[PDB]
Design a protein around this ligand. Structure first.
Ligand SMILES: O=P(O)(O)OC[C@H]1O[C@H](O)[C@@H](O)[C@@H](O)[C@@H]1O
Ligand SMILES: O=P(O)(O)OC[C@H]1O[C@H](O)[C@@H](O)[C@@H](O)[C@@H]1O
Lengths: 450, 450
């Protein structure tokens, strides 16, 4: 009965019209998940709803009001019910890699219990230590190269058929993707925008024609010099998927690009040369000159910073599958030894994706791995939704350090009131002082706007 | 010449087909704005791109690959160009409201210049004081009953036609919206999650056939206590637009609801009954009892928290429009007194929103206030873009203080494997003892899942 916004589909077939298998979303349903729908919309997008209503984009504040639209937000006549909720992220503060993983995989409520449950619901046998009669208790977490293994304790002996063969949950292949958008910074340790030099003068119009087609344009270059630290080692293994420019704090401007596919901890500063470029379209009255000034600045900035890195890992379940109750699509009854890897994080393929397999579980052709319906048959839709929501809970780790920059730049060429006496400049540029100041190859040139 | 996510439109018109005036987005362009496109997509939606490529929705990690789809992501053959960039937030350090307003309107480079320039680009006369030849200089900032007034110093004489009639920029109707997603916190002052009692016992199936039709259900209730402080008083005037759950720090799951349209400072919390209602539908074999166990915990967390509140305000330009040079759509030529207000912040209506006007500038019927194509022609596109980008640059204020919570709760009901001898329970519950631990009206009962 809840509308799942991740199942909406937009059609462009004319007023109130959906493609085969879809039907228009109504004003009340769209109200119930309103921020999800708007967030799936373009700034000024206006899309239709049932029965003469439209929802508007974030630029209009996601307003729902009567109106007509040739494109319509639609919802399946046969939606997939019982989606797996997405829980709030679990944030792990910055530390060394081993310590960050440890806080993750040794957490009984958020990792050991959920994943052991998962094993157990799929029919994996013996998911717990010998010191508990409950699933995912008495579980030893031990290092395995760059990951970990969690497996019931095996001290002393046991009963049960093959009871010594505990199921293992191997956590490996951790990756950490830094999210630029998660940037945050503590108090500005140091800040100041300092007027270093002013370049001042005149542009004259020596002619009868009121000159006004020309750009006047500053050129030249300077440096941004920056550095950062990394408080812990996890930074050695952290990357960012796409390059981004270091974010703007306050009234400064830097040219720092962080690069993709390269250690966070191996990008600790350096000197990139920003570029001077300002232009200005002045209109100059009948044989008059105009005052012209360009302010040159240096700026320092420094603060502690925090980004968050999305942690992903592979979870491999290994053990035998029980006679007369397991969830492999072929329902083997011979207790074969099994190994399956689920990718916990960004999707890699169908076989390794609980979300895919679960969302498609009513499509017979798609069921080539686990039989999720069987697990619902066993435990109820509820229990599975909540277990899987926990298993899939997003994990982030804090990546921290101190940041520091200084850069130089030029303000906008500023233009004054025209006073009376193909445009001409009279704005002295002391190449040598500027160069001494750090402003190199500076040049002022006049050229046409068309 | 980047692709503007805003101008993307999805068409469902068969493989490869766009609506008139649009063209398919190619795989390189999809790639450059991937997260934008993916965020407009159903979980498993697959959508066409140029030349037999497709992009897949978030469930598939935004993957781009060869494929066919009957809907297509398109882009205009003639896009609207020069979108006003969106700069990162200007961050004002927490203070009283008077401190936050003071800091904002007195900021020359971030407020006085850009607003002064904007008024000058629109044709307002004399945006500047007597003691400077430049726009947005020698500007007095005075208080006008409530908000502010920025206006050229008018002391001693001035030259120029009508030069005593200085344009004024007034700041007023401030508001402050807490952005929940801007959360960060300081040192996690104190944390801990402690077992206070284990309830154990049995559930019996005395009947001859297996039993799967009963929920075993825990009831009762516990208090949750949380408190927050407010370092400053801007907090009295902050609101959130929508309710949100206090965020999850640490491992701890606590339930807290910040309500909309209610002062931040008015919600420092207190004590809130939460229920322990919990349920499980076990399957007990013929003639058997399962071991049962419920764990009871207390947890507490505390820390300095920090959220950012968006500052929004009305910006009113008052002065006369120059003869032979203004942006009002009718281009008046009689130096009329003009007052116009823009809403710097969430959209309210067309007249008072720069972004809307800017973006719709090429629709002659939508030009009923300012002529932004004329501003572009007069000053150049880069210059207006950069100017408007400074005037629309988000301003935020830090909302800080201390957070603390105590909570009690039960782990899920756990079930052991069936051992041989609706459904019967022998699980002790000492009314008193439990109450002394902060667990009230505790009960365990069995009912039909129907
Ligand atoms: O019934 P199966 O397939 O042999 O499972 C073998 C074992 O699996 C589970 O882990 C437990 O219930 C054991 O007591 C059981 O004997
Ligand atoms: O005569 P107008 O064009 O109405 O403008 C009057 C004055 O306005 C502006 O502030 C300046 O450009 C002046 O040089 C001009 O004299």
């Amino acid at each position: 009965e809840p509308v799942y916004p991740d199942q909406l589909r937009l059609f462009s077939l004319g007023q109130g019209v959906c493609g085969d298998k879809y039907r228009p979303v109504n004003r009340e349903e769209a109200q119930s998940v309103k921020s999800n729908i708007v967030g799936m919309m373009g700034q000024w997008q206006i899309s239709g709803l049932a029965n003469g209503w439209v929802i508007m984009g974030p630029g209009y504040n996601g307003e729902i009001k009567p109106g007509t639209a040739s494109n319509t937000w639609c919802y399946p006549t046969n939606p997939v019910t019982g989606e797996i909720p997405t829980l709030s992220a679990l944030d792990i503060p910055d530390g060394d890699e081993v310590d960050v993983q440890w806080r993750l995989v040794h957490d009984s409520a958020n990792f050991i219990k959920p994943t052991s449950y998962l094993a157990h619901y799929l029919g994996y046998a013996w998911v717990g230590g010998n010191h508990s009669q409950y699933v995912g208790e008495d579980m030893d977490v031990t290092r395995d190269g760059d990951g970990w293994v969690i497996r019931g304790n095996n001290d002393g002996g046991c009963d049960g058929y093959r009871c010594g063969d505990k199921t293992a949950i191997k956590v490996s292949n951790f990756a950490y993707n830094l999210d630029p958008d998660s940037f945050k910074h503590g108090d500005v340790t140091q800040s100041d925008r300092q007027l270093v030099k002013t370049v001042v003068g005149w542009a004259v119009n020596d002619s009868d024609t009121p000159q006004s087609g020309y750009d006047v344009t500053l050129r030249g270059d300077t440096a941004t010099n920056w550095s950062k630290t990394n408080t812990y080692g996890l930074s050695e293994k952290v990357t960012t998927k796409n390059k981004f420019k270091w974010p703007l704090v306050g009234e400064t401007e830097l040219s720092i690009e962080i690069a993709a596919n390269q250690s966070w901890a191996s990008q600790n500063g350096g000197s990139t040369t920003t570029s001077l470029s300002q232009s200005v379209r002045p209109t100059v009255p009948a044989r008059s000159k105009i005052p012209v000034k360009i302010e040159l600045y240096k700026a320092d900035i420094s603060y502690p910073y925090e980004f968050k890195a999305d942690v992903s890992y592979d979870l491999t379940l290994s053990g035998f599958l029980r006679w007369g109750g397991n969830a492999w699509y072929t329902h083997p009854d011979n207790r074969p030894n099994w190994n399956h890897t689920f990718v916990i994080g960004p999707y890699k393929d169908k076989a390794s994706s609980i979300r895919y397999q679960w969302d498609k579980r009513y499509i017979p052709g798609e069921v080539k791995w686990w039989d999720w319906n069987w697990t619902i048959q066993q435990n109820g839709l509820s229990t599975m939704q909540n277990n899987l929501a926990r298993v899939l809970r997003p994990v982030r780790a804090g990546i921290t350090g101190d940041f520091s920059a200084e850069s130089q730049f030029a303000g906008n060429i500023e233009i004054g009131a025209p006073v009376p006496l193909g445009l001409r400049l009279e704005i002295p540029l002391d190449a040598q002082e500027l160069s001494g100041l750090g402003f190199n190859n500076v040049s002022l040139s006049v050229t046409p706007a068309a």
